[PDB]
Amino acid sequence: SMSVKKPKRDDSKDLALCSMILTEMETHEDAWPFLLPVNLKLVPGYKKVIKKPMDFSTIREKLSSGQYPNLETFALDVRLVFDNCETFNEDDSDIGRAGHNMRKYFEKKWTDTFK
Template structure:
């Protein structure tokens, strides 16, 4: 997901100096860097569902803060579609392995 063309707005936490009211509106921020650190720690994501929940929160935050006509909102929607497709194919592959 990190290398996807629409991932660029989500690679780092939102900088409050650039977007002063972001953390007033978004109370539970998420970004790809934070998710990567959590994956690398091997302790935070006890289940795959926890990882998916953080990704969904990242997408929802982008759509909550930004209006539909912004590039950030559009990137969020496209990246989420890519993410969901990858998750679905991973789940299907896992189901085939278990059969």
């Protein structure tokens, strides 16, 4: 509260670290469904169903241009990619499986880096 601060968690490496994690996700072999925005002119349903599209390239631009106020807002966008994937794809499709794998991959790097 006012003039009563919790000790300062060092956040000064967060930007570099989230960039590294993102690089690792960008280069995973199962990243392919997630690298670019879903083409909303060519994928029926996507526009109306998925209220908040997200993809790795958009996260990379946001990160590069100071659009994440902190590491949690970054983790929210990453998870949103996989949540959208689960909403639109059957678990037993190549894309649905890619999404599960990528989430698992992300969450391990996140825990190992920050927790």
